[PDB]
Nucleic acid binder design. Structure first.
Ligand SMILES: NC(=O)c1ccc[n+]([C@@H]2O[C@H](COP(=O)([O-])OP(=O)(O)OC[C@H]3O[C@@H](n4cnc5c(N)ncnc54)[C@H](O)[C@@H]3O)[C@@H](O)[C@H]2O)c1
Ligand SMILES: NC(=O)c1ccc[n+]([C@@H]2O[C@H](COP(=O)([O-])OP(=O)(O)OC[C@H]3O[C@@H](n4cnc5c(N)ncnc54)[C@H](O)[C@@H]3O)[C@@H](O)[C@H]2O)c1
Ligand SMILES: [Mg+2]
Ligand SMILES: [Mg+2]
Ligand SMILES: [Mg+2]
Ligand SMILES: [Mg+2]
Ligand SMILES: [Mg+2]
Ligand SMILES: [Mg+2]
Ligand SMILES: [Mg+2]
Ligand SMILES: [Mg+2]
Ligand SMILES: [Mg+2]
Ligand SMILES: [Mg+2]
Ligand SMILES: [Mg+2]
Ligand SMILES: [Mg+2]
Ligand SMILES: [Mg+2]
Ligand SMILES: [Mg+2]
Ligand SMILES: [Mg+2]
Ligand SMILES: [Mg+2]
Ligand SMILES: [Mg+2]
Ligand SMILES: [Mg+2]
Ligand SMILES: [Mg+2]
Lengths: 90, 96, 92, 97, 92
RNA sequence: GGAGCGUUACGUCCGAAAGUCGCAUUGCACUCCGCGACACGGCUCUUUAAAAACAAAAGGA
RNA sequence: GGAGCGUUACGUCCGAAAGUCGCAUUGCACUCCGCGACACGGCUCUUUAAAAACAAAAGGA
């Protein structure tokens, strides 16, 4: 089920929005160009982040290489997104 | 009882709310009496015999008189102060 | 963005301001003349400090040498400071 | 044939900046040495025999060894510390009288 | 428990051995011939002593007679010696 | 059961102190003293007071 | 009313506005959005932001 966009959860919910975005960007940029990182602190979406890679190539490599990577004292759980993100489908 | 009416360097106060703690009491007495003269000492004990009462020692008898007459019946912690002269000199005053 | 001043954080927040300043001078003086050390225990400054050097050269060496240096049992994190405006703000 | 220096849970520090007040010196020493383990005392004096010198008394000997080895020559108030194991408890007392 | 040797403790540890031994001999000879007195200021024996009587009856008397006696400002605690192996072990 | 150990709250001083609640008290001191009541994990020893450690989810200031 | 002032509990530090704490939440989105809590005597000035004094019957470590 690969996809340009990986779904990360089990993230530390105490981290401020833009710090979290920066810290994810630094730790996932190696894998390729990141189009965007979507983070929301609502009840429904805290602890979660969508990283949008330019290439599925980068996303797949990011998923297994960083699966369980320790991040703000919690191992991050990474799957592919179940749909396409807006930017990837426009 | 007949209040002590001999002018004296020290005024004897009673009918004081004895729920107040020593240091608060002394400190609040010094605030409301400092404008009458130099105060040499304020004596407060919470023992059985001495609670509800305070001694305020002025350097000059005139200060005590004006203090007594101005502050008589003053509401102090919801009780009106009763102020007399001390029946005897305080020791710092007898020394002198 | 290198400049005269380093921003240190992950400092042990249970140390008194006067002692924390003298202890920081003790280890950072080797790098250059310290113009000032800014510490406060306010909610905005607690666990953080600014050290201001006469020369930018000193701040840069201080940053790289003392990165992670354990200090009051905590490895300190060092960055270049932002603008004087940002400093004045976090100190009020 | 050359013998290892005998470990001690107390380290002897010298080449210290003599311009620092003793009280501050103690607290600054604590700040850089507490990382190696529990400190029981730091010994400094204004007396003339203790000039530019200090003892840091650790609970465990392993602490003193790690502290000596890691901080040997560490620049402290613009002066590299010289660190060695303390010799004996009598010697510490004589130096502190 | 009746032994010809008694074990004393709560002795002041700053008295030097010979002195402690002769002082002990004076206050105990009156009960019977003392064959020997064992003192040492090692970790195992500082503050304590064994007194070796020729006869058990000498040691039973000294037990109760001299119990709690004040000695260099401290009350003596006297007991029978448990075993000859304990005595020899304490003195090694 | 009993006793010793007062180490610990930010981190100090206390815990035979202190604060609080309830009575009682209108009282002339210079030194201070009316009752009564109201917390504490754990360690050690066993009518003995020694030893060496130790908690803020347990009391005061 | 407004603004500035953070001095005070044993006696030290702290004392919101885009921040903090507590509880709940493992949730697949691309138009904000769970619930609860954040005390405080007084002083000074009058849209200025300065000045120099100050409380534990008022919050936190
Ligand atoms: N860890 C420690 O070092 C330590 C030390 C003391 C107390 N504590 C804690 O305190 C609790 C109670 O202390 P305790 O175990 O000593 O019990 P406790 O204080 O009741 O015992 C004290 C002893 O002194 C006597 N006593 C009682 N009141 C007295 C008074 N006003 N004046 C003189 N003597 C009096 C009692 O008869 C008792 O034998 C313990 O359970 C423990 O939690 C801990
Ligand atoms: N003596 C002094 O030097 C001094 C100085 C400052 C404060 N104080 C004390 O503090 C009290 C309050 O200080 P102030 O008058 O400067 O208060 P303030 O100007 O901080 O505002 C008062 C109240 O507004 C509330 N508040 C803050 N941010 C908020 C937000 N985003 N949304 C809703 N409410 C918010 C806070 O609860 C605060 O207590 C004073 O009455 C005084 O008792 C004393
Ligand atoms: Mg009032
Ligand atoms: Mg019990
Ligand atoms: Mg008990
Ligand atoms: Mg006790
Ligand atoms: Mg603490
Ligand atoms: Mg009592
Ligand atoms: Mg009680
Ligand atoms: Mg107990
Ligand atoms: Mg425990
Ligand atoms: Mg109580
Ligand atoms: Mg108090
Ligand atoms: Mg008005
Ligand atoms: Mg403040
Ligand atoms: Mg204190
Ligand atoms: Mg006070
Ligand atoms: Mg809104
Ligand atoms: Mg909210
Ligand atoms: Mg608060
Ligand atoms: Mg805290």
């Amino acid at each position: 089920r690969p996809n340009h966009t990986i779904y990360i959860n089990n993230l530390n919910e105490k981290i401020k929005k833009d710090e979290l975005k920066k810290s994810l960007h630094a730790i996932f940029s190696r894998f390729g160009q990141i189009l965007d990182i979507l983070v929301s602190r609502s009840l429904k979406m805290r602890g979660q982040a969508f990283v949008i890679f330019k290439e599925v190539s980068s996303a797949t490599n990011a998923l297994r290489s960083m699966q369980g990577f320790p991040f703000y004292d919690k191992p991050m759980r990474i799957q592919y997104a179940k749909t396409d993100s807006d930017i990837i489908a426009k």
